[PDB]
Structure formats: C-alpha cells, structure tokens
A paper describes a structure:
Glutathione transferases (GSTs; EC 2.5.1.18) are phase II detoxification enzymes that metabolize a wide range of hydrophobic toxic compounds by catalyzing the conjugation of glutathione (GSH) to the hydrophilic centre of the toxic substances. In the present study, we report the kinetic characterization and crystal structure determination of Atu3701 protein from [name]. Sequence and structural analysis indicate that Atu3701 defines a novel GST class distinct from other previously characterized GSTs. AtuGSTH1-1 exhibits wide substrate specificity although analysis of the catalytic efficiency (kcat/Km) suggests that hydroperoxides may be its ‘natural’ substrates, indicating that the enzyme may play important role in counteracting oxidative stress conditions.
The structure of AtuGSTH1-1 exhibits the characteristic overall fold of GSTs that comprises an N-terminal thioredoxin-like domain and a C-terminal all α-helical domain. Close inspection shows that the formation of the dimer follows the ‘lock-and-key’ mode that is also found in the phi, alpha, mu and pi classes of GSTs. A molecule of Nb-GSH was found bound in the active site of AtuGSTH1-1. The glutathione portion of Nb-GSH is located in a region formed by the beginning of helices H1 and H4 and part of the β-turn between H3 and β3. In contrast to other GSTs where the H-site involves C-terminal domain residues, interactions in AtuGSTH1-1 are mainly provided by Arg187 and the long turn between strand β1 and helix H1 (residues 25–33). Analysis of the structure of AtuGSTH1-1 showed the absence of any functional side-chain (Ser, Tyr, Cys) in hydrogen bond distance with the cysteinyl moiety of the bound Nb-GSH. Indeed, the Arg34Ala mutant was inactive (kcat approximately 0.01 min−1), indicating that Arg34 may represent an important catalytic residue. In the AtuGSTH1-1/Nb-GSH complex, the conserved residues Arg34, Glu85, Ser86, Gln68 and Asn120' appear to form the proposed electron-sharing network. Arg34 in AtuGSTH1-1 occupies two alternative positions and exhibits high crystallographic temperature factors, indicating significant flexibility. In particular, in one conformation its guanidium group interacts with the γ-glutamyl carboxylate of GSH forming an electrostatic interaction, while in the second conformation with the sulfur atom of Nb-GSH (3.4 Å), the water molecules W117 and W304, and the backbone carbonyl group of bound Nb-GSH.
Numbering used by the authors:
A (entry chain A), B (entry chain A): 14 to 226
Write the structure that this text describes.
C-alpha cells in the first residue's frame, strides 16, 4: 500500500505557525501512524491548470494515494479516520455524533471565526472597519459561549480523542493571535490538550520544517 | 425501528422556498424512502435552554431517532446516506470522492455564496455596501467559474446521484433570487436536474405545507 502524498504551500503565509489546512491532515496521519509525503506548491504553481486536476478550486491540501485523489481537509481527515483505527469510535451511535462534531467544527464554528478574522486582518483602513469588526466579534463570542457551555468538563468532544477534535482544535487555533480564547478557560485548555499530543508535535514540526527549509 | 424526528422553523424566514437547512435533510429522507416527522419551533423556542439539548448553537435542524440525537445538516445527511442505499456508492474510492464533494458543498462553495448573500441582503444602507458587494461577488464568480469548469457535462458530481448533490444543490439554490446562475448554464441545468427528482418535490411540498399551515 503506497503512502499518500499531500499538497502544501512552499512558502506558507502562516509564518510557520501550522494554521494552514494541511495541518489537520498531517495531524490525522500522525495519530494513525501513517507515513506520508508532501508536494510543495508555489503560489504560481497552485494557479496552474495542472493543479486543478488535484484541487478544482486551486487550493491546498489535496491527497493522492494510488488512483485515489481527494480534496477538502475535512473529507481527507474523514478518509484517514475511516480506514485506520483511533480517530472514529466503533460504536455506530458514537460514530455518528463524532461526524456531527466534524461538520460543526467546519460549518458552525469555522465560519464564525473566519467572518471575524477576515475583517480583523484583511479589512483595516477601510471603515467602518472597527464597526464591522464589532459585529463579527459579537457573533463569534456568542458561538464560543455556546461551545464552551456545551463542552463543560469534557476532555474531548465525543468521549475519546477523535477526528472531530483534530478539526475543531485546528479551527480554534486561528484565534490564538487574537487572545480571545483567554476569556474561555475550558476552550483554551481544550486546545492546549490537543497541542500536547505527540502526534500534534510531529505534524507541527513537519510543517515548520517546510517553512524553515 | 422508529422514524426520525427533525426540528424545523414554525415560521420559516424563507417564504416557503425551501432554502432553510432542513431541506437537504428532508430530501435525503425522501430519496431513501424513510418516513419522518417534524417538530416546529418558534423563534423564541429555539432560544430556550431545552432546545440546546438537541442543537448546542440554538439552530435547526436537529435529528432525533431513539437514543440518537444529531445536529449539522451535513452530518445528518451523512448518517442517512450511511445506513440506507442510494446516496453513497458502495465502491470505496467513489465513496471517498462523494464525501469530498459533500464537504466541498459546505466548506468551499457555501462560504463563497454566504459571504455574498450576507452583504447583498443584510447590509444595505451602510456603505460601502456596493463596494463590499463587488468584492464578495468577484470571489463568488471565481468559485462558480471553477465549479462549472469542473462539472463539464457530468449529470451529477460523482457518477450516480448522491448525498453530495443534495448538499450542493441546496447550497446553490441560495443564488436563485440573485439570477447569478443564469450566467452558468451547466450549473443552472444541474440545479434543475435535482429539482425535477420526485424526492425533491416530496421534500419541497412538505416544507411548503409547514409554511402554509
Ligand atoms: N474547504 C477547503 C479550503 C481550502 C483552503 O482554504 N485552502 C487555502 C489554504 S488554508 C487557509 C489558510 C490560509 C492562510 C493561513 N494563515 O494563517 O496564514 C491560515 C489558513 C489555500 O489554498 N489558499 C490559497 C489560495 O486561495 O490561493 C479545505 O478545507 O480543504
Ligand atoms: N451548520 C449548521 C447551520 C444551521 C443553521 O444555520 N441554521 C439556521 C437555519 S438555516 C439558514 C437559513 C436561514 C434563512 C434562510 N432563508 O432563506 O430565509 C435560508 C437558510 C438557523 O437555525 N437560524 C436561526 C438562528 O440562527 O437563530 C447546519 O448546517 O445544520
């Protein structure tokens, strides 16, 4: 069985902080102990027609393994989790709820974060910057209130560590620079619990090596 | 085996057009021939602490079947598709690609649409409305260019009709009122192909009956 190959930025705009969407894929591969390879793409290469055969929207990551080509970080993590052990529970009820939280990370929490970080980072010096910022921030804090209340004292989202936690923690890490998570003690601790796992460190060190290459 | 129950708006803000996120769930249930029930929620009821036991962010839809409670329209469709026939292919490679397109509908196409419709509908009379509109519209047209080029002459996204088409068509329908799809002949035809299916009509008539009740 051939190791998979994933596409990643040659020069990531994240400063080596492991915030690009290859990170949850790398982390999933490390959790299941699957060796993998990367193909580094320049910004120009990502826009070439050849890359569209791998990712139809000219983005990263894609995943190639033999005849299989996949895209969507969420779907790539799903595929890894479906064919190895340790990222999805065996019990069918628990599994279905784990998949709910995978979708929630990407389709409920992520949009609230990105609506905020887009205004915060990309739209300064064109008002009402601070005004649009205040609105998206209010909606974000409401979603974090909801997530925090639901999580309570749980170690992970659905019993044992899962693919949902990989996706949710990588999404929440987009808030590290803002300091917003300091106001949500259990969410901060949750993110730190994930970052302390050895597979997280192996994935993080690998994206950092691409950055410092 | 008990029929599932899904939560829906008592008075949907969509004018009976079947654009709320219960629609893809209803459509999936109708495609697999699973009878189901609905629980209608007032806007006030959706905000009560009791609803949080079903949907932690106070939104619809949720899905209840015996001991199983799920949320996330994408994950609910996934669950339906995993335990019935006709929405996911049996071949493992084709199945993985179908899941990629389910995620793409919600995590690549949907955000580009919603970034546009949010400005277009919710942010008039606070400039630079037309300016922010132009920016989100440009990003949307680029994603539609990409989706259209990839689809080509395919009947459906991954061979046979699938859960990916349910999610993608319901997302694309948020553009009907804008007329934008008229400029993408194959995408328009794709949406119409889905809307012509008898299960789509059964789902649509049911949400309309809640509206006209
Ligand atoms: N839905 C897709 C979305 C993929 C995507 O957004 N890819 C981005 C990279 S991750 C998003 C990202 C970018 C930058 C940072 N950062 O911290 O600098 C973090 C995350 C990309 O290729 N962008 C280049 C382009 O659009 O041309 C998925 O989840 O796989
Ligand atoms: N990620 C979740 C998102 C759920 C969600 O956004 N639910 C919305 C309804 S569908 C979104 C929607 C709303 C309105 C129209 N419309 O046409 O009027 C279409 C779609 C909701 O409950 N909103 C009420 C609230 O936030 O208080 C999922 O996919 O299930």
């Amino acid at each position: 069985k051939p190791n998979p190959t994933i596409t990643v930025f040659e020069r990531s705009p994240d400063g080596g902080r492991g915030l690009a969407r290859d990170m949850p894929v790398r982390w999933a591969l490390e959790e299941v102990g699957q060796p993998y390879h990367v193909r580094r793409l320049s910004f120009e290469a990502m826009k070439e027609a050849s890359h569209l055969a791998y990712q139809p929207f000219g983005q990263i990551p894609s995943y190639e393994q033999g005849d299989l080509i996949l895209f969507e970080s969420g779907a790539i993590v799903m595929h890894i989790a479906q064919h190895h052990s340790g990222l999805l529970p065996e019990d069918q009820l628990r599994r279905a709820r784990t998949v709910a939280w995978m979708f929630a990370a990407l389709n409920t929490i992520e949009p609230s974060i990105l609506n905020f970080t887009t205004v915060w980072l990309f739209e300064r010096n064109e008002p009402w910057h601070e005004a649009r910022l205040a609105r998206t921030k209010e909606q974000l804090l409401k979603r974090l209130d909801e997530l925090s209340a639901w999580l309570g004292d749980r170690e992970w989202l659905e019993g044992s560590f899962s693919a949902a936690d990989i996706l949710m923690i990588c999404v929440l890490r987009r808030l590290e620079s803002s300091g917003i998570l300091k106001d949500y003690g259990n969410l901060l601790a949750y993110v730190e619990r994930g970052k302390a796992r050895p597979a997280f460190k192996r994935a993080f060190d690998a994206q950092l090596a691409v950055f410092t290459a």
